[PDB]
Design a protein around this ligand. Structure first.
Ligand SMILES: N[C@@H](CCC(=O)N[C@@H](CS)C(=O)NCC(=O)O)C(=O)O
Ligand SMILES: [Zn+2]
Lengths: 6, 400
């Protein structure tokens, strides 16, 4: 994932 | 739904009797609990040192990389006074300065982390030349990315933190206030402009976005930005504080779920995440600062609700980290403790620490960076050491 996803 | 993401809290809530083991009537930790914290810190540092041998050489950032490890050791040096901690910090600083990419401006994810941490480390080691060179580079870093977002990981408040970090640690105004002021003005202008563009103005005079979403929380969203704008450090005028920031803060307060938690983005219906990055553990900072600045009871009542949500659903299956983990969640209790002087919240923090003292015994997932400041063990160690003197404790790379 990307850094702080969802 | 939150329930599915958390372990049941096995501990009883505060009473004077249960609390006696942890701290005295002045909120000062017992010698015994202090030592148990220290013993765990020493044990975990051993594992962290070993684990970091396998970490990506290229990532020098505060969030996941080398500069973050240096943040921890500078802290441990301040807490324990052991010179070996300062030496460890030096090594990690050196690694981090070899990893500048010139792509980002923030303390957490950009070149500002290496540079600001290096400035402080060199200063603590009486190396004026290197310290001053780092400050110069940090000041000029502004230019590399205009049209940056406004948030913590990639945007303007992330760069501002780096500047404040230097000033705090030098104890003097090494970065002129005028530099901070200019960035603050850009943030406010950007917020007014976007609210005007989208016609938010009537309900929220300011609005911000990151990767085309209206994030609400500390890491990427409104709560982080407003927390900063309300800080005396940033010197926003009384005029703008009342006409722009306060109504915008109130808009965020109104997004609250029935549970007391907050959505990750405006319009998100799923009440799921109890993290610093998304939800009550990050939104609480805005609430507490709003209380300090505006003195309206509603902000304090909302903060109490946050603490209660976190006490119930804050021990995460995700792990023990800061960004989204039990240690980061525990900091929410310390911030409320430090506002109210209510020992109940110091107690809750101590119990969350008790949980962290059984690190790795709960079946928690392994983080993507298992030893890092924001995802891994360094952050958990940071919290345990910070708890030793609770009144001075601050969520690292964020809280002012
Ligand atoms: N890379 C993370 C995992 C991803 C993660 O937990 N991301 C955060 C945002 S920074 C989140 O809230 N995830 C969404 C979820 O838990 O559903 C780690 O190893 O700790
Ligand atoms: Zn996170």
């Amino acid at each position: 994932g990307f850094l702080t996803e969802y | 739904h939150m329930a599915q993401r958390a372990f049941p809290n096995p501990y009883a809530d505060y009473n004077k009797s249960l609390a006696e083991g942890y701290f005295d009537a002045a909120g000062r930790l017992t010698p015994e609990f202090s030592q148990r914290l220290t013993n765990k810190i020493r044990e975990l540092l051993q594992q962290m040192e070993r684990g970091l041998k396998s970490a990506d050489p290229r990532d020098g950032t505060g969030y996941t990389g080398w500069a973050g490890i240096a943040v921890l050791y500078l802290h441990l040096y301040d807490v324990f006074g052991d010179p070996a901690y300062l030496q460890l910090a030096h090594g990690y600083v050196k690694q981090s300065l070899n990893c500048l990419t010139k792509r980002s401006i923030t303390f957490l994810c950009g070149d500002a982390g290496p540079l600001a941490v290096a400035a402080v480390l060199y200063h603590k080691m009486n190396n004026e030349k290197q310290a001053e060179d780092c400050i110069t580079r940090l000041i000029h870093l502004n230019k590399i990315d205009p049209h940056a977002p406004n948030e913590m990981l990639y945007g303007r408040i992330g760069y501002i933190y780096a500047l404040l970090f230097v000033n705090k640690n030098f104890g003097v105004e090494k970065i002129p206030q005028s530099h901070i002021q200019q960035i603050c003005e850009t943030i406010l202008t950007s917020g007014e402009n976007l609210a005007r563009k989208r016609n938010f103005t009537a309900k929220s005079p300011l609005m911000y976005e990151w990767y085309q979403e209206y994030y609400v929380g500390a890491a990427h969203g409104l709560a982080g930005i407003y927390y900063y704008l309300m800080q005396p450090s940033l010197q926003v005028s009384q005029g703008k504080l009342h006409s722009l920031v306060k109504p915008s803060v109130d808009y965020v307060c109104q997004l609250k779920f029935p549970s007391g938690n907050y959505p990750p983005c405006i319009g998100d219906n799923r009440d799921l995440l109890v993290h610093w990055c998304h939800g009550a553990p990050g939104v609480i900072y805005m609430l507490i600062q709003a209380y300090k600045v505006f003195r309206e009871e509603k902000y304090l009542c909302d903060a109490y609700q946050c603490a209660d949500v976190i006490w119930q659903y804050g021990l995460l299956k995700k792990g023990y980290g800061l960004c989204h983990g039990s240690a980061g969640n525990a900091y929410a209790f310390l911030t409320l403790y430090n506002l109210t002087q209510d020992m109940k919240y110091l107690y809750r923090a101590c119990k969350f620490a008790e949980w962290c003292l059984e690190y790795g015994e709960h079946g928690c997932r392994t983080p993507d960076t298992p030893f890092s400041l924001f995802e891994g063990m360094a952050g958990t160690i940071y919290f345990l050491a910070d708890l030793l003197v609770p009144t001075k404790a601050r969520f690292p790379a964020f809280e002012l």
